[PDB]
């Protein structure tokens, strides 16, 4: 209970569902901007447009020329560039006076010892005059504008802004220089943010402020010159509080402790909306915080119960409660969703690493007869790549075929690839499975409507896959881990909820300590009979997916949810940078800025379509206008996908179980539409690896679940582990665009009949694949 700060009323918030919207609200608050502006986020891109007009850089640059006495300060995040320092350069550029803007890359603060390169800052936070406080999930970075079309037309933007990190760039930018070909997708963006005004804020300005100040304490570039500058620093504050009472050289810091930057403490205000402001931050990044405020001399009043010491697990906490206190149902976005989920399971024995995966790192993938003459598993086991046989790989070399250059090509490459791994494991300790209990919590909170008899339900929306191409090892790994959370672990969501629906089931049918083992009873087919549950009662798991006609080519890409958020009853909603994993919520790595928010102005709704039950005005709105947005009720005129008014009667009855039938009953249907024509896209059953048995073979009735590469197949459905080959090209693929001149491109049927974004997600896409990259769990947990 390390409070980062504590509820205040009387705040004004006003929620952004579009990209589109927060950008364009930024400008016109930068242009009121008269004292300070502070700006802070994972990622800064100076050249996005906010109002489609004018960069960042411009809006700052036209405020700077106004407000004489506007300072400006940027707190990037530090990649382990120039860039930012160059811009603020620029910003300050024939300036007025001295220069009044300012950058400090934020090097992370994180308590990982040596695994500590590989946290961030998370943060998205901007503040004006400190009066005018944002928050969310959206860096002012590229590819973030969007609307409620979801468009993906990327002809339409320029430079980087025409994102999508999964495909390949065959393009080209008129005045190296690709971009997103004329008939290659945009990745949309799904993102929630909001403007806040009232005394919340000061804790925004309070986060800025002690954040940038800890970093200036510990400006110092070498270890060696921070003393000096922590003795500088206890030296000049005598000195101010003496004034009060009537080579080896660290650099000046720059303080953010004049008293125009420094915001008053708020007054206790009601009404409005309250807020609490709510941090994941580590033990170092709090004791630094503490650094500055001798350093820069600023102690800025706390409340009463907040701390300035210990980690801060704010967000973690905030959502479990929020999960435990609902009474009828819960709506989250979040980019993530990987919590504990117990013992792995589902991996099919007799196959160590997914055949994609060992492709990519198991040496097996490999023919035997080049791995024995150039001696690779000596050289792996030692780990020394010189301990090799440099005769016999000449030998391969000088060898003409393709089988030897594929062979010593992708030898080279399983070493690059199982080299990370050997780093970050010996960075650092791998924590076994994973941390946080966002899991546990749903599926208590579903228990306890299981078991003492009352409706409710929870709404997961998440992205398909996390962005970029679904070759690259680590996303992978994150499908992996994000299917386990929710279907795979022994102890996974839907397992859970399941075993609950299960154990219920049997009240008074059997005797009660026997249960536990009736329930785990396998079954015809191999599984258990817990399994033979509808968890469909009270979970609700979505993704979100657009299609276009783009330069005569049917195309199709994801919706990405980058959303960190969180709503229960339309009362209370939990708004920011976290994500259900690890990093996010545990609070000692990567660092990140969240709201808890309840609207005081009251609003009577049927949320289950019978019984009148009291919300908050602005909450209820916010779920519905997104519910909207993704029902494709918000667009406006063009797109490929039509209004999927049929759920137009449900925005206003979240709890009602006719009301997540019909977005489980279309959800299912949209996406067995793209199936019917997309065998690329993840799914539940592989269509392209074939039954070559006289029967299918043990489990594999129904079908053959698909891989995290879906136009995979395995070469020997019996050996698994033989491996396999992609029978189709998938998207990443160069030649799933362009025909090379040996081979033709394949196309596809328009997907019939969908309505709205809303998409059903895959829960057995990658059953028994474990597609392990190989990198310390604790990085990507
Ligand atoms: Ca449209």
């Known amino acids: 209970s390390n409070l980062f700060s504590e509820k205040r009323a009387g705040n004004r918030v006003r929620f952004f569902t579009t990209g589109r919207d927060y950008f364009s609200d930024l400008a016109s608050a930068l242009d009121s901007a008269s004292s300070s502006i502070f700006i802070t986020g994972w990622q800064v891109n100076y050249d996005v447009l906010l109002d489609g007009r004018r960069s960042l850089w411009q809006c700052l640059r036209q405020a700077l020329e106004r407000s004489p006495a506007l300072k400006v300060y940027v707190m990037?995040?530090?990649?382990?560039?120039?860039?930012?320092?160059?811009?603020?350069?620029?910003?300050?550029?024939?300036?007025?006076?001295?220069?009044?803007?300012?950058?400090?890359?934020?090097?992370?603060?994180?308590?990982?010892?040596?695994?500590?390169?590989?946290?961030?800052?998370?943060?998205?936070?901007?503040?004006?005059?400190?009066?005018?406080?944002?928050?969310?999930?959206?860096?002012?970075?590229?590819?973030?504008?969007?609307?409620?079309?979801?468009?993906?037309?990327?002809?339409?933007?320029?430079?980087?802004?025409?994102?999508?990190?999964?495909?390949?760039?065959?393009?080209?930018?008129?005045?190296?220089?690709?971009?997103?070909?004329?008939?290659?997708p945009r990745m949309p963006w799904q993102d929630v943010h909001c403007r806040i005004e009232g005394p919340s804020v000061y804790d925004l300005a309070r986060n800025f402020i002690d954040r940038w100040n800890g970093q200036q304490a510990y400006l110092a570039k070498t270890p060696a010159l921070q003393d000096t500058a922590l003795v500088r620093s206890a030296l000049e504050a005598v000195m101010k509080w003496l004034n009060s009472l009537a080579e080896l050289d660290p650099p000046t810091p720059c303080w953010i402790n004049a008293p125009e930057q420094l915001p008053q403490?708020?007054?206790?205000?009601?009404?409005?909306?309250?807020?609490?402001?709510?941090?994941?931050?580590?033990?170092?990044?709090?004791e630094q915080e503490q650094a500055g405020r001798l350093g820069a001399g600023v102690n800025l009043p706390l409340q009463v119960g907040v701390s300035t010491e210990g980690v801060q697990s704010n967000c973690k906490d905030a959502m479990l409660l929020a999960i435990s206190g609902a009474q009828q149902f819960i709506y989250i976005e979040n980019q993530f969703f990987q919590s504990?989920?117990?013992?792995?399971?589902?991996?099919?024995?007799?196959?160590?690493?997914?055949?994609?995966?060992?492709?990519?790192?198991?040496?097996?993938?490999?023919?035997?007869?080049?791995?024995?003459?150039?001696?690779?598993?000596?050289?792996?086991?030692?780990?020394?790549?010189?301990?090799?046989?440099?005769?016999?790989?000449?030998?391969?070399?000088?060898?003409?075929?393709?089988?030897?250059?594929?062979?010593?090509?992708?030898?080279?490459?399983?070493?690059?690839?199982?080299?990370?791994?050997?780093?970050?494991?010996?960075?650092?300790?791998?924590?076994?499975?994973?941390?946080?209990?966002?899991?546990?919590?749903?599926?208590?909170?579903?228990?306890?409507?299981?078991?003492?008899?009352?409706?409710?339900?929870?709404?997961?929306?998440?992205?398909?896959?996390?962005?970029?191409?679904?070759?690259?090892?680590?996303?992978?790994?994150?499908?992996?881990?994000?299917?386990?959370?929710?279907?795979?672990?022994?102890?996974?969501?839907?397992?859970?909820?399941?075993?609950?629906?299960?154990?219920?089931?049997?009240?008074?049918?059997?005797?009660?300590?026997?249960?536990?083992?009736?329930?785990?009873?396998?079954?015809?087919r191999g599984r258990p009979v817990y399994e033979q549950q509808d968890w469909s009662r009270y979970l609700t798991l979505l993704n979100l997916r657009t299609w276009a006609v783009l330069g005569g080519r049917v195309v199709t890409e994801q919706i990405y949810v980058h959303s960190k958020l969180l709503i229960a009853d339309d009362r209370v909603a939990i708004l920011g940078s976290a994500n259900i994993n690890d990093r996010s919520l545990q609070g000692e790595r990567d660092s990140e800025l969240a709201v808890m928010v309840r609207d005081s102005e009251p609003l009577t709704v049927r949320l289950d379509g019978k019984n009148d039950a009291i919300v908050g005005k602005a909450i209820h709105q916010l779920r519905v206008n997104l519910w909207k947005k993704h029902?494709?009720?918000?667009?406006?005129?063009?797109?490929?996908?039509?209004?999927?008014?049929?759920?137009?009667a449900y925005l206003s009855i979240p709890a009602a179980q006719e009301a997540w039938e019909a977005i489980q009953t279309l959800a299912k249907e949209n996406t067995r539409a793209y199936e019917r024509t997309f065998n690329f896209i993840p799914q539940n059953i592989s269509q392209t690896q074939l039954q070559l048995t006289p029967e299918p073979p043990k489990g594999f009735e129904d079908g053959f679940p698909a891989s995290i590469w879906p136009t995979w197949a395995y070469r020997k459905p019996g050996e698994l582990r033989a491996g396999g080959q992609l029978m189709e090209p998938m998207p990443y693929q160069e030649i799933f665009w362009r025909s090379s001149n040996l081979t033709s491109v394949k196309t596809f049927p328009p997907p019939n009949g969908v309505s709205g974004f809303i998409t059903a997600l895959p829960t057995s896409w990658t059953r028994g694949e474990r597609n392990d990259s190989g990198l310390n769990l604790s990085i990507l947990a």
């Open 265 to 286: 403490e708020p007054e206790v205000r009601r009404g409005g909306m309250t807020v609490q402001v709510l941090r994941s931050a580590a033990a170092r990044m709090l």
């Open 340 to 524: 504990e989920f117990g013992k792995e399971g589902e991996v099919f024995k007799d196959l160590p690493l997914s055949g994609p995966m060992a492709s990519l790192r198991d040496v097996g993938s490999l023919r035997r007869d080049f791995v024995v003459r150039i001696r690779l598993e000596e050289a792996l086991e030692q780990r020394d790549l010189w301990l090799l046989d440099w005769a016999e790989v000449e030998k391969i070399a000088q060898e003409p075929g393709t089988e030897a250059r594929q062979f010593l090509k992708s030898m080279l490459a399983m070493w690059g690839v199982n080299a990370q791994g050997w780093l970050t494991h010996k960075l650092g300790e791998a924590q076994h499975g994973l941390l946080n209990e966002i899991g546990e919590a749903l599926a208590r909170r579903i228990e306890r409507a299981i078991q003492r008899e009352h409706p409710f339900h929870v709404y997961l929306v998440l992205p398909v896959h996390p962005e970029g191409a679904l070759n690259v090892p680590n996303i992978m790994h994150q499908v992996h881990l994000t299917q386990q959370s929710l279907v795979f672990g022994e102890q996974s969501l839907v397992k859970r909820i399941q075993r609950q629906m299960a154990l219920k089931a049997l009240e008074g049918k059997s005797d009660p300590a026997q249960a536990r083992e009736i329930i785990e009873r396998k079954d015809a």
């Open 76 to 184: 990037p995040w530090l990649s382990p560039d120039f860039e930012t320092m160059l811009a603020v350069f620029q910003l300050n550029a024939g300036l007025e006076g001295g220069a009044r803007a300012f950058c400090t890359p934020a090097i992370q603060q994180s308590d990982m010892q040596g695994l500590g390169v590989a946290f961030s800052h998370h943060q998205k936070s901007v503040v004006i005059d400190n009066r005018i406080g944002y928050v969310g999930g959206i860096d002012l970075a590229y590819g973030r504008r969007d609307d409620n079309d979801f468009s993906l037309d990327a002809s339409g933007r320029r430079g980087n802004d025409a994102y999508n990190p999964g495909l390949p760039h065959l393009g080209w930018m008129a005045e190296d220089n690709a971009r997103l070909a004329a008939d290659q």
């Open 631 to 648: 029902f494709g009720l918000s667009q406006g005129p063009g797109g490929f996908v039509k209004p999927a008014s049929e759920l137009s």
